[PDB]
C-alpha cells in the first residue's frame, strides 16, 4: 500500500502567481485594499447580512453513528460549544465565527487551540487565541507541499514587545481558508468587488464637481482692453466674479462697456444616478447577494422578493459548509483524541438547511402525524419512530430529531 | 457537509467547470476494521497538467504533470501518474475525452462589457464638465504673459469652476457644442453584462435581479435554470461513479461485479403543499396498523411514479447505516 | 433581512453578560461552580405565528383526555423535531422554578 | 496541559494602526466625530429602532443543564435581573443596555460591578457604575496581550474634583466591545456611515 505520488503544487502560470495576476492585490499590499473596503457602507451592509445569516443557521452536532458511544462523544462536544436555540453558546464558540469572518475578508485566518484539565478529569477547551492575517509572515510547507506551520510577526497588544518569526505547528491551530482551490491558498470574497468599488468612488467625485457648475454657474466678465492687472478697475472685476459665487443677493452694477454672463453649458446636467447605483449595487452582486442592497424596498420591483432571498441562500449555505469543514477537520479531533485515544470516527458540527419557507405545509403535516399516534400509550416514542420512517423530503421539512440534545438533556 | 474529502471532490469539479478539466490523486490507507479506506484526494490544477497520454486506441492512460511544489522547495518536471490512481472531471465531454470551459460562450459579452464601461466613463466627463475653447486675437503670441493667461483660463475652467473668467473684449470663451444630449448606453451595457450569465444557462436576469417591471412568476425562471444545474450534478456523479467508487470497493471485494452509485434528489418544481397533504392521507390509511413504519413503506413503493417521487427518497442504505450494532 | 444585523448585536451583548457578569454573581455563593447559566433571547426572524398557533391547538387536542395535561403536553413538545418545537416558543423550566 | 505559545497581537500593518487608517478617526478625536453624528436625525432614527428591537428580544436565562442544582443557580440569576415579559426588569438590567449602547456608538464602554450581602445571606448585585469612553485613558495588558485593567481620568459629576489615572482591575468590571476582530479592539458601528453623513 503506497502513499501520495503527487505533491500539492502552487496555482501559478505566466503572470498568475499563487492565484493572483494583479500586482496591486498580491501579498500584504492586497490586505490593505480589503481593509479600506470595510469603510464602504455597501460592503459593511453586505457583511452584516451574510455574517448574521451564517451565525443564525441553527448549529448542532451530528454523531458519527447511532451507537451509544458515538452519541456520548457527540454530547461532550455539544457541551464544550454550549449549543443552544439562538446559537449564543459558550465564549469560544463566538470567537471561531470572528476568526472565520477575517478569513472571508482577507482570504485566510487562524486560532491557537489551548486545552486545560476539566473537573471530570477530561481535557477540555480553555480558549482560542485569534491570529490576524496582518500578523502572519507565511505558511511553511513540508517537501510534499502540505502545510506544517505558520510564521508570525507583529506587536503584542498593549505594546510590551514585538513578535518576530515565531513558528506555531499546524496541529496546535484551526485554519480558515475562503474558497481554497486545492493548493491551500485562500482568496478574499471582496476580490471580484474591487472594480465596482473603485468606479463608485470615481463617479461620486465626478457628480459632486458637475453639480457645482450646473447649480451655481461659472461666471465670466468681459472688460475693455484698456483695463490692466494691478488697477482699481481690475480689483472691481475680481470682486464682481467672487461676489457672484459667494453673495448672490449682492447684485452686479456694470458700466456699459462691461458684460457679465455665465458659461453656456448647452444642455441639462446628465443624470449619472442610474450608472452610480449600477456600480454601487454591483459591490453586493459580486459577493453572490441576489437582491439589490442599495434600492432595497424602493421602486417598481418583482412581486416575489422571497425567491431572491432563497437564491442568496445558495451562496450563504456554501460559507456555512466552509466554516463547518474547518471545525470538523482541525478542532473536534483535538478535543476527542486526548480523552478517547482509540477514537477512529468523530462527531461533526452541522446546521439546518434553510432554502425555502415550507413552514405552513410542514406544520399541517406535523398535526396529521400527532393525530395518527394520539391514542398511543407512549406518543413521543411512537411519533419519533413514525418520523424516521418518512421519505427524505417529508422527514427534513419537520426539522431535526436531535438524539445528541436528548442525551445532554438526560437529568443525572 | 460530509467528511473532509467529500468537499474536496466538489472543489476539483469547480476547476473542471472553469477550465474544462481537472483531477485528483486517490490515496487509500488501512482502516481499523481491516478494510482499505479513502485517506485523501490530492487535487491537480490544470495549470500544472502538461497533457493526457493515450493508448493506441485513443483511451486515456496517464497524466503528465509539471509545476512548483507549494512553498517553493522544488520544480516537478514531467511526473507521470496512471489514470487508475486518479479521478478525472471533464466539463461537456463531446465523446473525444476533451473537456471545454463553461465560460467559453461568455467571452464575447465579457469583452464587450469592459469596452462599454471605458466608453461610458469617457463620454460622461465631456458631457459633465464640457471641453473649454478660448479664441484670441492673432496678435497674441506663445511665450508671452497673455499666452500663460489663456492656458490658466482653460485649466481653471476644468479644475476651479468657482474661480471665474475675466476676459478682454476681443477674447471669446465657449464649451464645444456637442449638438445633443448624451446617449443612454445603460441598456446596451446591461444587455452584454446580463448576457454573461445567460451564456452559462441561467434563465433569470442576474444584473437587474428584483428591480424593475417583471414577470409575476419568478419561480418558473428558477425552475427553467434547474435543467442546466441538474445536468452539472449528473456530470459530477458520473465521474465519482466511474473513477472513485470502484477503487474503494474492489480492494475489499475483489469479486465485485456491480457498484453503488452517488446520486441526488431531482428539484424541478415546488409541489410540497400537495405532497405533504398526500403524505397525511397515506399515514391516516395505515394508522390502525400494528406496525405503521413497515406498512407505510410497503404502500409508498406501490404508488405510481409521480406520486412516489413527490414524497422523497425511502433510503434503505441510510436505514442500514442507522442500525445500532 | 434587517433582523440578521440586530440578532448579531443581541449575541454580542449576551456574550459580555455571560463572560464578565454571571460568574462574578455565582462564584461568591457557589465557589466550586464549574458551569454557569447564560442570558439568551428568542430568535425573531419571520412571522410564522398563524401556522404555529394552529399546531399548538392540535397538540392540546391530542393530550386533552390526559389526567395531567400540562405534564403530557410538555413531554410531547420536547419530542417534536427542532423547527416545530422552536415555532411554539420557549418552555422555560427556570421561570417554572422561580414561580414555585 | 500546555499554555498558549501565541500572544494576542494588535490589528496593525503599514498605515493601519489598531484597525484605523484615517488619522481624523484615531483615538479620542475619533470619539468627538461619533458624538457629533448623534445630533443627525437619520442617525438617531436608526439607533431608536436598533436599540428598541435589541431590548424587546424576550430575554431569559438558560441553565447550564437540566440538573436541579443548575436550575436553582439559573433561578438566582433570573431573580437578580428581574426577567419579565416586557424586559423591564430591576434597575441594573436597564443600565447594562445603556452601557452597551455607548459601546455601539464609540466602540467600547464598561461598568463597575458592586456586590452587597442579601437578606438570605447571599452576595447579590448592588449596582453597575457606568464608565464612558470619554473618561477611559487606556486598557492595560499583561505580557501575552490579555486585558488586566482600565486607566480612567475625568471630572466627578457635580465638579467636586478631577480623577487622574485611577486603575480598576478587569475582574471588577463588565466590558462591552462592538465588533471585536480578535485583538480586543472595538470599533464604532458609525464608522462606515461617516462618508454618507459628510
Residue numbers in the entry:
A (entry chain A): 26 to 437
B (entry chain B): 113 to 437
C (entry chain C): 336 to 435
D (entry chain C): 26 to 223
Reproduce passages from the article.
A key step in the assembly pathway of double-stranded DNA viruses, including bacteriophage and evolutionarily related herpesviruses, is the packaging of viral genomic DNA into the procapsid. During this process, the large terminase protein docks onto the portal protein, which is embedded in the capsid wall, and translocates DNA using free energy liberated from ATP hydrolysis. Cryo-EM reconstructions reveal modifications to a canonical capsid protein fold, resulting in capsids that are abnormally large for this virus class. Structural information on the portal protein, through which the genome is packaged, demonstrates that the capsid influences the portal’s conformation.
As the previously determined structure of this portal protein was for a construct lacking 20 N-terminal amino acids, we determined the structure for the portal protein with an intact N terminus. One goal was to test whether this segment adopts an ordered conformation. This structure was refined at 1.95-Å resolution. With three subunits in the asymmetric unit, the 12-subunit oligomer is generated by the crystallographic fourfold axis. The portal protein forms a canonical 12-subunit oligomer with an overall shape consistent with those of portal proteins of other viruses. We refer to its domains as Clip, Stem, Wing, and Crown. The subunit−subunit interactions of this thermostable protein are enhanced compared with portal proteins of mesophilic bacteriophages SPP1 and T4 (34, 35). There are 39 hydrogen bonds (6.6 per 1,000 Å2) and seven salt bridges, compared with 26 hydrogen bonds (4.2 per 1,000 Å2) and five salt bridges observed in the SPP1 portal protein, and 22 hydrogen bonds (2.9 per 1,000 Å2) and four salt bridges present in the T4 portal protein. Of the first nine residues of the N terminus, five are positively charged, and thus may mediate electrostatic interactions with the capsid. To investigate conformational states accessible to the portal protein, we performed normal mode calculations with the crystal structure. The lowest energy mode with 12-fold symmetrical motions exhibited periodic compression–extension of the portal protein along its central axis, characterized by a synchronized up-and-down movement of the Wing and Clip.
